């Protein structure tokens, strides 16, 4: 009787859009907030008045 | 191996008149290349911290 939507398979392509894909990345906050030191080896001693 | 001479008589008809045959010989002595090796694994942090 009639042409269905299955009856025209692949004459009707489907589209793609990246509109929702992007997700902004967030860094460490302790690297923002606190002073860093560049270590040269595994261990560093820091004396403190106790 | 080395060839060997002999003392020979004069005769036309007798075994002691005949000059004996003899042979040198050579042999093969060979080089064959064989592989000697070692792996020394170490942690990359130890190589950075040394």
Q: Would an 8 Å CB–CB cutoff place A38 in contact with chain B?
A: no
Residue by residue, DSSP assigns A1-50 as ----SSTTBTTB------TTT-------SHHHHS-----SSS--------
Instruction: Provide φ and ψ at B48, rounded to 5°.
Output: -70, -40
Resolution of the structure, angstroms: 2.5
Rounded to a whole number of angstroms, the distance from the CA of A29 to the nearest CA of chain B is 26
Q: Contact B4/B23 with Cβ under 8 angstroms?
A: no
Tokens describing residue B34: 């064989």
Instruction: Provide φ and ψ at B47, rounded to 5°.
Output: -65, -35
* CA distance linking residue B3 with residue B26, whole number of Å: 12
* CA distance linking residue A20 with residue B44, whole number of Å: 40
Q: Contact A37/A44 with Cβ under 8 angstroms?
A: yes
Tokens describing residue A34: 């606190």
Q: Would an 8 Å CB–CB cutoff place A41 in contact with chain B?
A: yes
Among candidate residues B20, B26, B25, B27, the one with its CA nearest the CA of residue B4:
B20
* CA distance linking residue B39 with residue B41, whole number of Å: 6
Residue B49 per-residue DSSP state: H
* Best B47, B49, B50 residue to mutate vs chain A (most A CBs within 10 Å): B49
């Amino acid at each position: 009787a009639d042409i269905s939507r299955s009856e025209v398979a692949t004459l009707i392509q489907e589209a793609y859009a990246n509109d929702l894909l992007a997700s902004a990345k967030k860094g460490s906050t302790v690297l923002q907030a606190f002073p860093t030191v560049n270590m040269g080896t595994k261990t560093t001693h820091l004396p403190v008045l106790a | 191996t080395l060839p060997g001479a002999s003392w020979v008589s004069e005769s036309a008809t007798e075994p002691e008149g005949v000059k004996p045959t003899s042979e040198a010989t050579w042999a093969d002595r060979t080089l064959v290349a064989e592989e000697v090796a070692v792996i020394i694994p170490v942690h990359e942090n130890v190589v950075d911290d040394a």
